Design a protein around this ligand. Sequence first.
Ligand SMILES: Nc1nc2c(ncn2[C@@H]2O[C@H](COP(=O)(O)OP(=O)(O)O)[C@@H](O)[C@H]2O)c(=O)[nH]1
Ligand SMILES: Nc1ncnc2c1ncn2[C@@H]1O[C@H](COP(=O)(O)OP(=O)(O)O)[C@@H](O)[C@H]1O
Lengths: 318, 322, 332, 340, 238
Amino acid sequence: LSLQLPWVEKYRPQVLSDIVGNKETIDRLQQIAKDGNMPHMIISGMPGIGKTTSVHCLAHELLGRSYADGVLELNASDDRGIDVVRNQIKHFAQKKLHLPPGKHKIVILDEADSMTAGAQQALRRTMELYSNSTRFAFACNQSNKIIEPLQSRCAILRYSKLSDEDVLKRLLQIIKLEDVKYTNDGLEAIIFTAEGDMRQAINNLQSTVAGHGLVNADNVFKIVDSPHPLIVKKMLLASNLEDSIQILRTDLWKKGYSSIDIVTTSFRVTKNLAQVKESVRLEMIKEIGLTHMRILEGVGTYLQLASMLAKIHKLNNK
Amino acid sequence: LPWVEKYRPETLDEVYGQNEVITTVRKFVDEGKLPHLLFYGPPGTGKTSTIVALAREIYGKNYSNMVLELNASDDRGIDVVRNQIKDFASTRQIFSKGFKLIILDEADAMTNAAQNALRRVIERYTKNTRFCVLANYAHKLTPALLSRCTRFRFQPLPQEAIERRIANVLVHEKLKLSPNAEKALIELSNGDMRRVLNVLQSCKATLDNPDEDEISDDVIYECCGAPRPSDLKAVLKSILEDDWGTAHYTLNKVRSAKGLALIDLIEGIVKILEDYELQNEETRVHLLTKLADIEYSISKGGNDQIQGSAVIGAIKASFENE
Amino acid sequence: LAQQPWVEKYRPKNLDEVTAQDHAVTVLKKTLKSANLPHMLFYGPPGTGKTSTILALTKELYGPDLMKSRILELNASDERGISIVREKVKNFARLTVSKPSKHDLENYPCPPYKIIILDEADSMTADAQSALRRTMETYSGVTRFCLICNYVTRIIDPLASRCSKFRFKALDASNAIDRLRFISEQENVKCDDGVLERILDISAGDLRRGITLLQSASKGAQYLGDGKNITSTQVEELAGVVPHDILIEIVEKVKSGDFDEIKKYVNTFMKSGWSAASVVNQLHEYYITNDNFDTNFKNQISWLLFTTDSRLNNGTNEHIQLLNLLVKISQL
Amino acid sequence: SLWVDKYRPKSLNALSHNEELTNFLKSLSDQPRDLPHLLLYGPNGTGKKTRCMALLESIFGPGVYRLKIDVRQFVTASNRKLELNVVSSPYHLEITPSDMGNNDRIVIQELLKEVAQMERYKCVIINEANSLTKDAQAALRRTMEKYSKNIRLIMVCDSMSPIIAPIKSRCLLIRCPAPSDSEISTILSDVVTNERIQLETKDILKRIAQASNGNLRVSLLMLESMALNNELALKSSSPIIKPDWIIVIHKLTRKIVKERSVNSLIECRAVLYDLLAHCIPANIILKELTFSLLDVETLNTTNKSSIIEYSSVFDERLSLGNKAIFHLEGFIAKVMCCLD
Amino acid sequence: EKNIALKPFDIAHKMLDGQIYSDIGSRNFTLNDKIALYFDDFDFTPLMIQENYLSTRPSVLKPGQSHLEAVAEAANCISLGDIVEKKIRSSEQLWSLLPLHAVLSSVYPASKVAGHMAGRINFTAWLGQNSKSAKYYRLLQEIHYHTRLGTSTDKIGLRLDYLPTFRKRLLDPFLKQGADAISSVIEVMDDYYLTKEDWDSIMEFFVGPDVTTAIIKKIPATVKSGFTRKYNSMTHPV
Ligand SMILES: Nc1nc2c(ncn2[C@@H]2O[C@H](COP(=O)(O)OP(=O)(O)O)[C@@H](O)[C@H]2O)c(=O)[nH]1
Ligand SMILES: Nc1ncnc2c1ncn2[C@@H]1O[C@H](COP(=O)(O)OP(=O)(O)O)[C@@H](O)[C@H]1O
């Protein structure tokens, strides 16, 4: 047997210059690393965009040698105990270490917004008590969920979804490092599948390389578990409602694709239908989103998809 | 013993196919790039057999010490399985080298908090432990858990393979099945072999004659507790051809006597109506939109009689377009 | 003794006392003759005798005294979620089986297992039913499940396969009215002409709701110490049902079609406190089953009533919804 | 000591309107031991809370009015701290669990279990029962089943439709219609004779009753406001005094009818922001605006039909949204488009 | 630094530009770019669009369509987007609906009323109004807690019905009687356990013709001094 090292873990960024997206936030973090004084910061944004990686890279940049022991990572929603993690924070902060005067120990907490008001007040008191030695970083989805004192004391950094250009640049870097043979349509397919999700894009690239070796559209969509975009495009653009329903019933519903995947792929494909007028695309997107809302409420049947197709067809032919 | 345990596809030969997943996992192991795997699809496709075969091939004789098999949904709760995983990953033998595999079955049954805890555990022990997650529906899993794992989808078995397996089960169990009953069973199971085996065993149990009697489609529909196509066809004919009083009476009488929920009646009627040859497309547009609205309203509660009359009116009004 | 609800007071005691469910009672008698009792799935219209029959079967299996210890009655819709129900079932199964006395052993078969009755099973979600199936599989050695529901099609296939299904026919109007009349005579309830018929109509044939309404009417007539017969207006009041005169006035105002008259009437109507949902339900009943309206009118009015009911179910202002509904019908 | 509160009936004998309901409540107090769970539903400001308190006084005595107020603290899952204002007496409790939002279920469970453990029985008055969540109502049904020995619930709501059927089956439905204009006039006449208010004619009281639209609280407060404005001498020419927010909404209605443009819509937005910021609920604003628009005499049937349809749509949207100004502005824009 | 505050303004100005909604503008600036504009600072973009979508001069009007019809359609879409946002940010955590919320709250309403900006891109007023509403609801809750024993009403009923008559009984006597009315005002306050802080809070709730800021300011300072002195000189019920 041998050790396992996935590409996603292997090529996670280490220095702040490795991160591709969020140019302004990365520039601010680089400035903070340069001037050698980390303030308390709260990073917020939509979930799954890799917020904690930025503060880990910041800690690596700040601590030239103390990066191994000067970083503590915890999860606020971890049911091991809010009091338990608070006590661990107190122990880590009270544990002084040899450092240059401008640096401090760094604690990273995830899912801070899910904490109670009392828990946030306790963390605020702890941060004030050990502000001379340990600085805190809070990762949250909604900034307003964090109490006002913490927001006022901390510096808010906003993290946004990565654009397709950043995903393309990162994928090209990984491909060059991994001598991956690819085609432009394959990378376009991977970027299309992973809507700003760097982790999913890297995972799909690795899986496609393992499965087929060549990264082209057909291989990518064979590896990818979502419905094929060409099938969804044929279903959406069919001039006859019977044809659209037939394509759905045969190629998507009977193939085992879930309704969530179908509506998500419909949203993705409709958004990119360049030959259709944008007003028509917006109407189609509105209908697809309505059925997505219905599905997420627990209906998620075949009749909802058929009705979505009926409304889209009604829009298309005017 | 349950008929699901028997006739289980314990070997790759009994697997219907789609060995591309097996080959890709094998190449992941060979290249040292094996990620946390997620196998999902219809129940009974053989995900458990595939993963145990892969584990046997990877490790060899030292199977039980390096591989831990668990069911994510168990009566002992989240804490017990979490403790099991933590004590399995934390402990290291003298010959500790490589990685250790943990397999979770029926992971979609876990609650969101349990899934988040499992994701945190996977992230913590990822240095020396590789997780394989099995589920029936990938969409039921939390997006946070889906991001960690590499998704592999299992296609439903082709109808010919299902028919061959059904014939094998019938000849092994000495059961005679009507062709209509077989078609009904295949349609109801929609590719789930576990459902096929359970329904066949229950139907054999319910027969007054254990071996000589023939299982009809009526018996299959009673065993599954599903709307019979004859009832739905009668309701649809009454709606289309009879006046409002007769249609209302027929719908209420049929779906109360036979115990058919209104949403199941709508689903069956939509399934039947798809085979109709409609001259006008507006008929289909109105039918689909109105019936979807009615079903969505039913999901939220509301007045049942009003919703039934809404179904009748929606079907009647659309066919005015011919 | 203290006062007891008439629903549980007049349940049939033995299987021979179930009136109209000949088929289900016969099949259950045959199953009881066998020493092995499978999982049972009771389905049919509400208030037909499902819980009564399962209780009678349990009483015959265990005896009047041992029945309480061997039975756990649950309601899957009443509980917070799956976890509480499954934990209660686990605790009941882990609890040691009660010791039957010599009389219990010699007068009744006293099977070793314990029967668990789960009411309103069809209201469970798919995940809840799958967890229930897993729990049933875990403790199938000592517990036999009975699922009581109105729609068998709302129960998932894996769970429904394990259960032998008994279909209960809807009670005929004559049988239900005779049962209500017997209850009224036993309890000395003075009822005028058509009061029991009105109770059945309000309950939509549900004998449980009919008995509950009859008991409430009897208590109300006890409060009003005039000693007179219960009137249909009183039972309409106790059920939150709008009087037919107000419904006819609403229909006439809609027929005339003047917007201002309809608005004024709805403003006056909302001050009386009558429920708007009851008005929508009774308007649906009036219009749909009426021979003086053609097919197109009813096609339109069914959708109108459906839209109004859907909006009312969202917790909206009753006045606005009712006015919109009445104005839209007047334009048909 | 406002006249609406000074002359509130403190007993079942002091009630003056809806005599049949008073007789029924008197009959209920004759057998306190088997008191049913109650659910009182009707229009606002008709005397439901007064009748509940009078029934409590009949059962227990005047001590029910010795009301003391306290704050109870509860701990939820994930250790969330809650505070509920519980108005108590030596005999009864009053709670408004809807004030806790979706956390009303746990509050109800904990408080009712505590009261049952402490205890022949203690009456709990639940205000705004129609705004309780479905989970809270299920918990209430469970507590009714468990603690019927020591807990008797008196739920008060304005509409019984949001109440679930299982609760309705286990409670006695009591319908409280709004008083007629004659009864309101009689009550106001009693008040003015008590307070020594000059009246040119009794038709002024009829006008107040008509303007109050069956709301007895509103009619009493309007009478007091009118009396103060006229130095305790009401004349036949004395104008009806309406609240500030109603005047603002009527001004908005006149503005919408007069001019339909985008600038008018911006100024309507400013007005709506003014109303919402000062604790005027969005549903109240929508209802008042809709029924002011329908009373404009220059509009035809088509305009009014469109207005009521848009009102229904955007009322449903208000019940499902977060930011109310969005829905109110959408409704006003649609009405402006339809009036053209 | 300051560019962070200018990002929502830039996004709102760009999304309401009518050039990017013509055919050529759509080709040059596709729908993906517009949704990406939303996802840059997705907290404020729907608020800015709802704030500024009435201040444009539309150039994308269909033939026979007026500006008012376009703003009505945009407002309808904004309301739908608000419902979607509520379902997203609730406990269900439906973060997969973010692109749908983008289209419903930012892109579609902008498409309906895109054009030249008639004026300036104003910041959203909803945040300040929400804070003000929360403050006034807290004040109303405090007043209701103080006056709950004496009044038979809920909090909303207290705001809608009781407060005008409380204004007649607590502020009007000062205008016509002056310092002579201090005793009666204090007596009325004592009957409802109203502190002077509650007296200050009550007068802030009135709108339209009943605003009391100028009226209170016009009251002589001697009357206010006598009022506070008399209140502080006697014990009060609690
Ligand atoms: N004189 C008199 N006043 C009444 C009567 N019923 C109600 N009221 C008045 O109506 C006002 C409001 O009633 P309230 O208790 O708030 O009823 P609710 O808000 O509808 O539950 C009270 O302040 C009473 O002064 C009655 O029978 N006689
Ligand atoms: N077949 C029947 N014969 C006599 N009484 C019946 C019958 N069915 C229902 N009831 C009456 O209905 C009441 C309870 O109904 P129940 O059986 O709980 O309804 P469900 O069928 O929904 O369980 C009992 O008091 C019983 O008298």
